[model samples]
Target: DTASDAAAAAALTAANAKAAAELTAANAAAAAAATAR
Candidate 1:
């Protein structure tokens, strides 16, 4: 049970990291688009 818990935590960490990167990229694109217009 402990091993499975650890694995799940690691997976969650990876997912959150990916989500954070995507959010940052999306914001950057939005700002660029605003400036372009």
Candidate 2:
């Protein structure tokens, strides 16, 4: 079952990375918009 856990962890890591990347992009966009104003 250790291998099963590893696979699950990989999936979780992917999702976590995706969320972080989206948040980073959102923050960057907000900063750009504020600077433009």
Candidate 3:
């Protein structure tokens, strides 16, 4: 289960990275919408 554990750790960080990245995208989109309106 060691390999599986490492796989999950990698996946966990990758998943978390997306959470932060999406925030960046969300802020940009919000700014764009605000500008358009």
Candidate 4:
């Protein structure tokens, strides 16, 4: 049970990091588009 709990926590952390990175990339793409005008 403890091992499963730790795995879940790690998975959640990785997911959150992935989400943050995706958001940052999307924002950067939008900014680039706006500047291209």
Off by over 4 Å in 1: none
Candidate 3 weakest ten by summed lDDT: 15-24
Q: Name model 4 segments beyond 4 Å from true.
A: 35-37
Q: Write the per-residue lDDT of candidate 2 for residues 1-37, one digit (tens) a residue.
A: 9999999999999999999999999999999999999
lDDT of 1 by residue, 1-37 (tens): 9999999999999999999999999999999999999
C-alpha lDDT of residue 30 in model 2? 98
Whole-model Cα lDDT of every candidate shown, in order: 1.00, 0.99, 0.98, 1.00
Q: For candidate 4, write residues 1-37 as lDDT tens digits.
A: 9999999999999999999999999999999999999
Name the candidate that leads on TM-score: 1
**Model 3, which residues run further than 4 Å from truth?**
31-37
Q: List the residue pairs that clash in candidate 3.
A: none
lDDT of 3 by residue, 1-37 (tens): 9999999999999999999999999999999999998
- The order by descending lDDT is 4, 1, 2, 3
Candidate 4, number of clashes: 0
